[PDB]
Amino acid sequence: NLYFQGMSFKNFKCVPKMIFGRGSFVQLDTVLEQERTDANDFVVFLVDDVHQHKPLAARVPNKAHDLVIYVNVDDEPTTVQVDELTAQVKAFNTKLPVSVVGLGGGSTMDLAKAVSLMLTNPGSSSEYQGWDLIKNPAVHHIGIPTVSGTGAEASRTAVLCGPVRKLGLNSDYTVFDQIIMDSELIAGVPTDQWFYTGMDCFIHCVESLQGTYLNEFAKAFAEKSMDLCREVYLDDHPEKDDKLMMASYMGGMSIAYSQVGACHAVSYGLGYVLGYHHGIGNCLAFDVLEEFYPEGVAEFRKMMEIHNITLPKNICKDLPDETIAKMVAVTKSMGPLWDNVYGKGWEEKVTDEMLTKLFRRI
Amino acid sequence: NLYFQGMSFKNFKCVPKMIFGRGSFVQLDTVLEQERTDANDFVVFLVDDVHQHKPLAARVPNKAHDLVIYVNVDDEPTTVQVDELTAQVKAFNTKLPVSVVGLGGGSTMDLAKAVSLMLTNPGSSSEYQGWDLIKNPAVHHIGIPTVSGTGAEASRTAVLCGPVRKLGLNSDYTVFDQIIMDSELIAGVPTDQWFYTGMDCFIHCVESLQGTYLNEFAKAFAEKSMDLCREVYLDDHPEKDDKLMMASYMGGMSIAYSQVGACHAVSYGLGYVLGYHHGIGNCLAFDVLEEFYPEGVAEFRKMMEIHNITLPKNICKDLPDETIAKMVAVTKSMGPLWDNVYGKGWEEKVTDEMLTKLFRRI
Numbered sequence: 001n002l003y004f005q006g007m008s009f010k011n012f013k014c015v016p017k018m019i020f021g022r023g024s025f026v027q028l029d030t031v032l033e034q035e036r037t038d039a040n041d042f043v044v045f046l047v048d049d050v051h052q053h054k055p056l057a058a059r060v061p062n063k064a065h066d067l068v069i070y071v072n073v074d075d076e077p078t079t080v081q082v083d084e085l086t087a088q089v090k091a092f093n094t095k096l097p098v099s100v101v102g103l104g105g106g107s108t109m110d111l112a113k114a115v116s117l118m119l120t121n122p123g124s125s126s127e128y129q130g131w132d133l134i135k136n137p138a139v140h141h142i143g144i145p146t147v148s149g150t151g152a153e154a155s156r157t158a159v160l161c162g163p164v165r166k167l168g169l170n171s172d173y174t175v176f177d178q179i180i181m182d183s184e185l186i187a188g189v190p191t192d193q194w195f196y197t198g199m200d201c202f203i204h205c206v207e208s209l210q211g212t213y214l215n216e217f218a219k220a221f222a223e224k225s226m227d228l229c230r231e232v233y234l235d236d237h238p239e240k241d242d243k244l245m246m247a248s249y250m251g252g253m254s255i256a257y258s259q260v261g262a263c264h265a266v267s268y269g270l271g272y273v274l275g276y277h278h279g280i281g282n283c284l285a286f287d288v289l290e291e292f293y294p295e296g297v298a299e300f301r302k303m304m305e306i307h308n309i310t311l312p313k314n315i316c317k318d319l320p321d322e323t324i325a326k327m328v329a330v331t332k333s334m335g336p337l338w339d340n341v342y343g344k345g346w347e348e349k350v351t352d353e354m355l356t357k358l359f360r361r362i
Numbered sequence: 363n364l365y366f367q368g369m370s371f372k373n374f375k376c377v378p379k380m381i382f383g384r385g386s387f388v389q390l391d392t393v394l395e396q397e398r399t400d401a402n403d404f405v406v407f408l409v410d411d412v413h414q415h416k417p418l419a420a421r422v423p424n425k426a427h428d429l430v431i432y433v434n435v436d437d438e439p440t441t442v443q444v445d446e447l448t449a450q451v452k453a454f455n456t457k458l459p460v461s462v463v464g465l466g467g468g469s470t471m472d473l474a475k476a477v478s479l480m481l482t483n484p485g486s487s488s489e490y491q492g493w494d495l496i497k498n499p500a501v502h503h504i505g506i507p508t509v510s511g512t513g514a515e516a517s518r519t520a521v522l523c524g525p526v527r528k529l530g531l532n533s534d535y536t537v538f539d540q541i542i543m544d545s546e547l548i549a550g551v552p553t554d555q556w557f558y559t560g561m562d563c564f565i566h567c568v569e570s571l572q573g574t575y576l577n578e579f580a581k582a583f584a585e586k587s588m589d590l591c592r593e594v595y596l597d598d599h600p601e602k603d604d605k606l607m608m609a610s611y612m613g614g615m616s617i618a619y620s621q622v623g624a625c626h627a628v629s630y631g632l633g634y635v636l637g638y639h640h641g642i643g644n645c646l647a648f649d650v651l652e653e654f655y656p657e658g659v660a661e662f663r664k665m666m667e668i669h670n671i672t673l674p675k676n677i678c679k680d681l682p683d684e685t686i687a688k689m690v691a692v693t694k695s696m697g698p699l700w701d702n703v704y705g706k707g708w709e710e711k712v713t714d715e716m717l718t719k720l721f722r723r724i
């Protein structure tokens with residue numbers, strides 16, 4: 001009773017080293033130099049290929065023996081892609097790299113987390129989708145966001161589309177060893193993507209604050225994160241880039257000690273079955289969940305108006321029942337998320353009938 | 363210019379593992395068990411002796427071969443005390459312990475940090491007062507607050523009164539490997555101590571937010587910390603114990619990426635020379651620094667009224683000039699703090715004349 005409650009609290013592993021500041025990408029070489037202990041040590045840089053022909057590519061401090069892979073996140077990470085990148089690293093050099101760097105958004109960061117894991121753990125990444133399935137430590141890995149809002153930089157998961165579902169590699173080993181938060185690097189994100197990924201953060205906060213998993217640690221982080229989001233998207237603050245990077249991080253810290261909810265549940269269906277990306281998919285879901293998060297949706301609708309956002313509509317209106325069934329099956333399987341939303345007895349409330357009504361309104 | 367600014371940002375090492383929740387002290391045994399790799403491994407528990415005859419002593423999970431030291435913080439930590447505790451550990455067992463636990467307030471936590479360091483670094487702790495002087499990693503160490511507000515649980519320093527001054531062992535190695543934040547443990551702190559240590563947190567926030575070292579990372583933490591303090595001390599919130607623990611932590615994270623200021627500067631003089639403890643000494647200083655922090659002092663004066671706090675007065679009114687000179691010398695030597703307050707050209711503003719006027723009003 002009293003003992004069992006005390007033992008229940010999560011021992012949260014967070015990112016132990018962080019650099020925050022505009023221009024701080026310049027420190028990556030010095031950071032990596034502390035990991036290079038031999039002449040023949042190498043680093044893997046996984047760089048979102050949006051950067052491949054941009055000035056940021058030329059700033060990547062790769063040595064002649066390092067491996068730079070410009071990764072394609074036009075579709076979100078899959079277990080097939082993680083396995084293919086991991087095979088690439090092994091074919092390039094059988095020696096473990098001394099670090100794996102993820103330079104990009106949530107997709108690229110999650111690829112770097114997953115590759116850093118699959119280098120020291122056998123089999124397909126599909127065998128590790130779930131909770132605490134990883135038994136060997138990852139290779140040292142570094143997260144450098146070039147889009148802000150997912151909180152992927154701060155979290156203990158790496159979300160992948162596998163054979164059966166979208167589900168993350170949840171493990172203390174997944175957590176980045178180092179992150180660099182340089183808001184100069186988010187400069188050229190298109191406005192709509194900036195908005196959608198930023199709303200991922202906003203929606204994290206709302207779902208955490210409504211949920212049954214909440215404690216004061218998650219609550220302090222989620223409230224300040226949500227306030228920073230307001231400064232970014234409502235107040236048009238001049239330091240909105242640094243502010244959005246802090247919101248993202250604090251939002252990740254929040255979820256890490258709580259849980260996401262109904263909007264993420266639904267979004268994962270749209271994402272797995274129809275291929276909608278996470279930022280926009282969350283927003284699509286959120287716009288039909290006003291009964292769940294009345295104030296959040298109202299505020300988000302106001303943010304959309306300011307930023308000229310028109311969500312695509314009638315995505316699911318004329319789709320076959322078979323395709324809707326697949327989305328409902330994926331969303332229903334997210335137990336912890338619906339537990340957060342509803343509490344004990346959530347199985348009886350989250351029916352196929354109700355989820356189907358939601359998806360048909362998207 | 364642009365490169366030198368990018369390189370200037372601190373690579374912040376924070377506490378990598380945290381448990382937050384009421385009753386979570388019960389997990390300490392399981393946590394320590396992960397560090398015990400032999401039958402003959404031992405742990406040092408440094409326990410604030412306020413707990414020695416209280417029920418919390420009986421909950422400490424010491425094995426027969428472990429060392430429990432009930433430490434006396436009636437005076438704040440000195441280099442002599444750190445050296446004496448370190449000698450005690452070495453005389454008890456020449457083998458390094460697998461962890462050093464600090465169960466107490468800021469004083470006890472700083473003792474545990476310092477001992478964990480001096481076990482692997484030669485000489486007196488006085489030789490390490492300063493910045494980045496520690497060259498060998500500390501023994502694994504765990505922080506468990508039983509008074510909330512210093513932020514000692516989150517910081518990279520351990521503040522000691524040495525031969526010459528109050529100055530900390532500032533180093534990435536100083537940082538706790540693990541903290542447990544169980545607000546049941548702060549239950550029996552007397553009201554005035556609860557207020558004074560809590561105002562340490564409040565004052566951290568104010569000094570950080572006024573300063574020239576501020577960035578958005580320190581700013582987000584300090585603002586939310588300050589809001590939590592208001593919930594605790596103005597709103598009388600029912601979850602004030604968990605809230606104050608979060609404020610303390612977030613306040614420590616803030617200072618860690620910024621700096622304290624004029625109030626801490628002055629407080630360190632009162633502390634070193636006259637022996638005033640840190641919480642009450644800060645409040646004494648703050649009450650004469652209204653020109654520096656007008657809004658902070660006003661709000662703190664209001665908090666004092668609610669909590670029936672009457673600061674002792676005329677402490678310095680009738681003291682010899684020689685004794686005031688000593689306090690001014692210590693306060694003036696805090697360069698980074700006055701740099702935070704004033705910026706470049708602080709040496710010309712922080713004169714003996716001005717500091718002497720302040721101290722005479724305390």
Ligand SMILES: NC(=O)c1ccc[n+]([C@@H]2O[C@H](COP(=O)([O-])OP(=O)(O)OC[C@H]3O[C@@H](n4cnc5c(N)ncnc54)[C@H](O)[C@@H]3O)[C@@H](O)[C@H]2O)c1
Pocket residue numbers: 048049050073074076077104105106107108110146147148149150151152155156157158159185186187188189190193197200277278279
């Ligand atoms: N690991 C976690 O804890 C966690 C949490 C939430 C979401 N996620 C995952 O994050 C992924 C989405 O990440 P995201 O929303 O950051 O988007 P993303 O990484 O998928 O990138 C979105 C688009 O922005 C582009 N882009 C990135 N940086 C840019 C730059 N500076 N300039 C111009 N364009 C740039 C990319 O090339 C891409 O086309 C999803 O797969 C989602 O599941 C992970």
Ligand SMILES: NC(=O)c1ccc[n+]([C@@H]2O[C@H](COP(=O)([O-])OP(=O)(O)OC[C@H]3O[C@@H](n4cnc5c(N)ncnc54)[C@H](O)[C@@H]3O)[C@@H](O)[C@H]2O)c1
Pocket residue numbers: 410411412435436438439466467468469470472508509510511512513514517518519520521547548549550551552555559562639640641
């Ligand atoms: N390391 C850092 O980053 C940092 C930052 C700020 C201050 N400090 C240091 O922290 C020290 C002050 O710490 P503090 O303000 O927490 O006070 P403290 O640790 O000195 O303890 C204050 C008093 O409270 C008592 N106490 C502790 N727990 C109690 C409990 N649960 N019930 C009843 N009484 C209890 C103690 O026995 C003591 O008498 C100073 O030496 C200061 O320099 C360190």
Ligand SMILES: [Ca+2]
Pocket residue numbers: 049070071072
């Ligand atoms: Ca390509």
Ligand SMILES: [Ca+2]
Pocket residue numbers: 074
């Ligand atoms: Ca593309």
Ligand SMILES: [Ca+2]
Pocket residue numbers: 411432433434
């Ligand atoms: Ca004693």
Ligand SMILES: [Ca+2]
Pocket residue numbers: 436
């Ligand atoms: Ca005593």
Ligand SMILES: [Cl-]
Pocket residue numbers: 070071072081
């Ligand atoms: Cl790829």
Ligand SMILES: [Cl-]
Pocket residue numbers: 157158159167168169170
């Ligand atoms: Cl996941």
Ligand SMILES: [Cl-]
Pocket residue numbers: 189190191192
């Ligand atoms: Cl655009």
Ligand SMILES: [Cl-]
Pocket residue numbers: 206210292293294295296297
């Ligand atoms: Cl809401």
Ligand SMILES: [Cl-]
Pocket residue numbers: 432433434443
């Ligand atoms: Cl002692």
Ligand SMILES: [Cl-]
Pocket residue numbers: 519520521529530531532
């Ligand atoms: Cl110090």
Ligand SMILES: [Cl-]
Pocket residue numbers: 551552553554
């Ligand atoms: Cl009392």
Ligand SMILES: [Cl-]
Pocket residue numbers: 568572654655656657658659
């Ligand atoms: Cl002020």
Ligand SMILES: [Fe+3]
Pocket residue numbers: 150200201204264278
């Ligand atoms: Fe998300």
Ligand SMILES: [Fe+3]
Pocket residue numbers: 512562563566626640
């Ligand atoms: Fe302090």
